[PDB]
Symmetry: C3
Subunit: 249 residues, 3 copies
């Protein structure tokens, strides 16, 4: 038996809203340490990695390590029935279904759902040092990608110790954004150690941006010929990293 | 002459946005106590019963009982030219084939004057047995609508069940099941509260497609009443103001 | 070099919004006294008449009086990328392209650039039978509502009264607007200076276009006389105005 309790139900709500259109099916991998999800997107370009930790949950227990294939879209549906202040409570029974329990606080309302669960079959993500690491705000990164998605299909991200520039070009013109190294946690911090210039796909960056309601900031980690890492930290919980290789032939 | 003056024009706006995709064309029965409307839905499944009483009108005049057939879509489209705070006046002539809607704007700045084509509708008076139900549940408007759409994504049907300690709503479907439980409230101001009075535990199944229709009457009241007994239709009731009410009748699905 | 600077970029965004749906390609006629535009729409039916006087800009430069062929829809997709308190500056250098630079209010700095292109007429001054001043949103809601009733609005003006009418398959409507009186609050008041009474009939789809400029002013004026086009006027703060011209129907 596995029964984890999360006071911050909105966190689950937001995770699933993020991933629901990115992947359709994913193997949540339940452990003594916490929850882990590693997957490639349906078109097998980007790579998602979610980590939630025992310590984050109000209550956590896991007597057998589980490997649940879940339909992201169906879980999205079931969680959408939860208020953004409910105490979601996940539970299984070494397992054919996944039980969810929403508990709206300060109201005698209690919801109790069971999701049909899938048979699904990992992958490698080597923690490595990155040439440059921008910690900017989530809203601004979102904004920037949204806007440049109307000029071109791809984005050119250039970095150095003075600031970060994001560029794009299409049939309908040319465009540049220039952010400068900058107080209240709403500032840019480039810690670049090497001349990093990389091109990525705005479709998939915009897919990444949906985790924005999870963090006020977002870090972008990158080096030559190495998949970009967009990470949104969750809280006490771990993180929701996104990996995208730049386009080269 | 028929002439009725409603200060809260929003009442009529909301009544007709509630009854629009359900009923495509109804027959309003105007008389001395007020306006009544009573109609099957276009799929002949649910029954709608609106009652606006003469007392809620600032000015109520009816010289001759009317059965004026209105295309509810055209009425909604005309009432969408009325303002949330507009005083709305209904006027028809005794020998009239049109209904004149007249919207007075708050500071007398503007007055709108619309005229809507009537039509002849041959409609029988579907009877409505006056029953006493096994249990009645008072509960917030929005909370009910919230349960009813949420379960609409898990199943297409909703099993309501009633006992002295609260009321439960359940559904099943091709991705699992769900079950929402509400308890009788004591304290909750007080518009928000889930009270029940019961004579007998009931457990009935209803199509969610139609309950969601009904929940489009929510703007009308911060509460809703569910009335239930075995082998008799569910009644979902919204009081308008201390003026009348909108009632929906849905029939359960058969018992194994 | 043309270089014009505006601290309320919101105003240009609103202009491109108030124009992108009538014209696709326009010719900014830019000179020392301000920027101008006076174009017919895609169906040669309506007339649009943009005027940003240079004294309204915070930094205005014009070395020569140029005609910039500008795809308004592409200009608008670019203008979408700027913020509402943003600080927008246009530049055209020696000859060829248009540049749009948005200074975030913040550490952001945006540099967009679009291609120009290789694409007039006369509008005379006039003393109209009827001038009606009203709140922009009110006239907007009138056109919005009456569009759901019919495809043509009869606007008839007389003393103590302006009256909008329409009719269609489901019925007919007639909205009567009165001149506000002993409370003269200026931008929520209606005012009818009525030289000689008039009836005119206009297509509501074009008026409904014009109302897209509604966010530019809290008032609007309607100038109108027999057998001559109606002038819908949205005075852009205090640097110019925007003007729509529509003759009666059939």
């Amino acid at each position: 038996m596995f029964e984890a309790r999360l006071v911050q139900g909105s966190i689950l709500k937001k995770v699933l809203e993020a991933l629901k259109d990115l992947i359709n099916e994913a193997c949540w991998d339940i452990s003594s340490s916490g929850v882990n999800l590693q997957s490639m997107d349906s078109s097998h370009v980007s790579l998602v990695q979610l980590t939630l930790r025992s310590e984050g949950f109000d209550t956590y227990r896991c007597d057998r390590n589980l490997a649940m294939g879940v339909n992201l879209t169906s879980m999205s549906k079931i969680l959408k029935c939860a208020g953004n202040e409910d105490i979601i409570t996940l539970r299984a029974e070494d397992a054919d279904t996944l039980a969810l329990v929403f508990e709206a606080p300060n109201q005698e309302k209690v919801s109790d759902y069971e999701m049909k669960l899938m048979d699904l079959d990992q992958l490698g993500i080597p923690e490595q040092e990155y040439s440059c690491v921008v910690k900017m705000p989530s809203g601004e990164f979102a904004r920037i990608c949204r806007d440049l998605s109307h000029i071109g299909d791809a984005v050119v991200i250039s970095c150095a110790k003075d600031g970060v520039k994001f560029s794009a070009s299409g049939e309908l013109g040319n465009g540049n954004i220039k952010l400068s190294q900058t107080k209240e946690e709403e500032a840019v911090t480039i810690e670049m150690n090497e001349p990093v210039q990389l091109t990525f796909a705005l479709r998939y960056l915009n897919f990444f941006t949906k985790a924005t309601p999870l963090s006020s900031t977002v870090t972008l980690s990158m080096s030559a010929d190495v998949p970009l890492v967009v990470e949104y930290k969750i809280a006490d919980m771990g993180h929701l990293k996104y990996y995208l290789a730049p386009k080269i032939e």
